[PDB]
Ligand binder design. Sequence first.
Ligand SMILES: NC(=O)c1ccc[n+]([C@@H]2O[C@H](COP(=O)([O-])OP(=O)(O)OC[C@H]3O[C@@H](n4cnc5c(N)ncnc54)[C@H](OP(=O)(O)O)[C@@H]3O)[C@@H](O)[C@H]2O)c1
Ligand SMILES: NC(=O)c1ccc[n+]([C@@H]2O[C@H](COP(=O)([O-])OP(=O)(O)OC[C@H]3O[C@@H](n4cnc5c(N)ncnc54)[C@H](OP(=O)(O)O)[C@@H]3O)[C@@H](O)[C@H]2O)c1
Ligand SMILES: [Zn+2]
Ligand SMILES: [Zn+2]
Ligand SMILES: [Zn+2]
Ligand SMILES: [Zn+2]
Lengths: 352, 351
Amino acid sequence: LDLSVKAVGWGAADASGVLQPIKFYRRVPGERDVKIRVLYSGVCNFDMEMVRNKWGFTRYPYVFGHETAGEVVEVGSKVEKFKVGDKVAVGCMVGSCGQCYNCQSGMENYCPEPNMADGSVYERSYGGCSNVMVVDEKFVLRWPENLPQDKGVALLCAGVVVYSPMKHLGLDKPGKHIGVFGLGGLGSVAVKFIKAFGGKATVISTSRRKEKEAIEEHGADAFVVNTDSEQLKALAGTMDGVVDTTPGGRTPMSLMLNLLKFDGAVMLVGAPESLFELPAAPLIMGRKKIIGSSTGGLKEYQEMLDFAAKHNIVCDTEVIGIDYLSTAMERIKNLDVKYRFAIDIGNTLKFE
Amino acid sequence: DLSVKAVGWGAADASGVLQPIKFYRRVPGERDVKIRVLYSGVCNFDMEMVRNKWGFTRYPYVFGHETAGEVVEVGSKVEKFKVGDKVAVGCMVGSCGQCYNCQSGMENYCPEPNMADGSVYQGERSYGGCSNVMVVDEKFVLRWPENLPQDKGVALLCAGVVVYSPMKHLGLDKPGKHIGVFGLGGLGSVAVKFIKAFGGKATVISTSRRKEKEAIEEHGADAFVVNTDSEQLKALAGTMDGVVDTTPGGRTPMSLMLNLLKFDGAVMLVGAPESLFELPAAPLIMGRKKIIGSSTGGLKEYQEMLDFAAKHNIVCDTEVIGIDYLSTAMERIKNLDVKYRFAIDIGNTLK
Ligand SMILES: NC(=O)c1ccc[n+]([C@@H]2O[C@H](COP(=O)([O-])OP(=O)(O)OC[C@H]3O[C@@H](n4cnc5c(N)ncnc54)[C@H](OP(=O)(O)O)[C@@H]3O)[C@@H](O)[C@H]2O)c1
Ligand SMILES: NC(=O)c1ccc[n+]([C@@H]2O[C@H](COP(=O)([O-])OP(=O)(O)OC[C@H]3O[C@@H](n4cnc5c(N)ncnc54)[C@H](OP(=O)(O)O)[C@@H]3O)[C@@H](O)[C@H]2O)c1
Ligand SMILES: [Zn+2]
Ligand SMILES: [Zn+2]
Ligand SMILES: [Zn+2]
Ligand SMILES: [Zn+2]
């Protein structure tokens, strides 16, 4: 009896970054392992850049996927969390050292030795844009019954990235006024989380066309175009926090600091592109802070999903077949999707 | 009503030529404390303010945010201070008293602070503590601990509070923490001494190789590194819970300070802003690191800081001078030729 787990995934074989199918094996499920039939895989800006090795974290062959939703088809004998049939998800990590202070305190995303699903080096692994995953139960998330997997799968990226810093800073309280720069996947979900927390959300966007969806769909309290200097001046000193989802350096730090109240925080989550110019005087005079954040701990992933489910929050998602992946990447780059693609792996990814 | 006849030192205009300035203080109201000034600290801030370096200076200008003296009179409703008590006044003599910051004891972040030296941070016209007498609302008067000398201690009102406040806010005032300190002057040296007394570890990064001995032997630093020693700094990557930057803003690379931090580390900027920092986002994001600024402290923090310094016998290295040396002292302050602060003996030399 051949036990091996045959898999196929999409990514790049070479540094050229040309998208291709990649055949490989998953390990046989150990006693604590969960074998997952992948139903949906999110794709985002991060994946699009990783395939071209924008940041030097990519090892080839490279199968992307840090946004994975599926169903349990097999469990190891000592698995307690999940049974066959259960809907589950996997985020950016499939392992950590488990003995460092970060791991002990539930911040596995800041383990010095993370085991990334897509194998990014910042074990040799293949990501969730594949037919099947085998993952230790610790790193598998329970999927809430009331969330659809197709529209929800992007929460694993869009959701956790914004939820984690807001919780860390204690901004997830009623009454807080939070500004959000850039209304894409992260931006839109941030607005929806802020409203559900009982806060007030202001959107600053480069796209005037997004006013309607910001106000009418996401429930933002205000929408401001980034070039509207007089309106931005008027919002000086009004925000408990600012969430910057724009590429690092594309929004002036001086603007973001000026919008903050005393003790306010700028939360940088966007991909670094260029240096910020940082004036010290606003930080010092206002005891303001700038903080960065990447993904979230395992607990935060689960809490985020449970929260989204409670308030019926999803990410605006376009569901596509695997054969459209090349075009999807182009649309991601051109900011021509509202706001994320989800790949229907379960129905469209096939062998040979 | 005006009453108390007063003399202070400062400048009449932007030339910054030091002179005596004659004025009157108000009669103590019911909540006021009249203070005979015994010592006044002077520092970089004062030296620059007299020349209006930053445009905050209103003339005539009598500096002094580091004032220690004794109570000679109190208003009828003051109970906390009695005649004869040793006291101090810091940078503020008033605030709006009704904003969230004021209510939560962070008067230094009131939108409408009343500065001792009258610097426009609006704000009421005032003359600072480099004067023979002060009249101050009891709320803004500090109790001076008996076991600290006023002459060597008065600089704590500036050097001490500025570094103590952010470390407390960030929870860095705990045993085991490793804190880096850029610039070993008044703030730097006192920071080291606080860090050690908190039970932490202090590394000093300085531009002056000659300060190695005093850093280790006098202040109790665990390590000393020259700022141009790239290889040593590389080796300290990822070791520090916090970095205190006392250098002028923009003089220390932000990339260096971020690189020195551990996961969840904080950069604390307290130095006078001079030029923009270049901020790379990647270290912040990857390490969940933070950059914060801080200015002076709340009234409670001033008092806690003094009480703490007293408990551990912490003072600032101070050169005590007469008022007639003030012109030369300003020059030495600018040339970084004092270890590390001047205190003026007002009580005995200002007539
Ligand atoms: N920290 C983490 O853990 C983490 C994890 C995943 C992703 N990220 C990063 O988070 C960022 C946002 O993710 P996303 O999926 O929402 O990205 P996205 O769809 O590529 O862009 C989000 C929005 O940012 C604004 N924007 C994009 N490019 C811009 C530019 N050059 N100048 C100014 N504004 C620009 C646009 O908003 P408007 O149309 O409103 O102007 C756009 O809709 C990306 O940089 C991504 O790499 C970070
Ligand atoms: N945030 C606040 O509330 C507040 C309040 C008062 C003062 N301050 C500011 O805090 C800073 C420190 O005060 P201080 O009285 O300790 O200052 P200082 O005696 O003028 O300078 C302190 C030390 O900083 C270093 N330094 C000075 N100029 C430098 C330069 N151009 N480049 C690099 N390093 C330089 C030197 O250390 P090394 O010899 O070791 O290199 C010097 O001994 C000043 O900028 C002061 O204005 C802030
Ligand atoms: Zn670990
Ligand atoms: Zn993603
Ligand atoms: Zn106030
Ligand atoms: Zn001072």
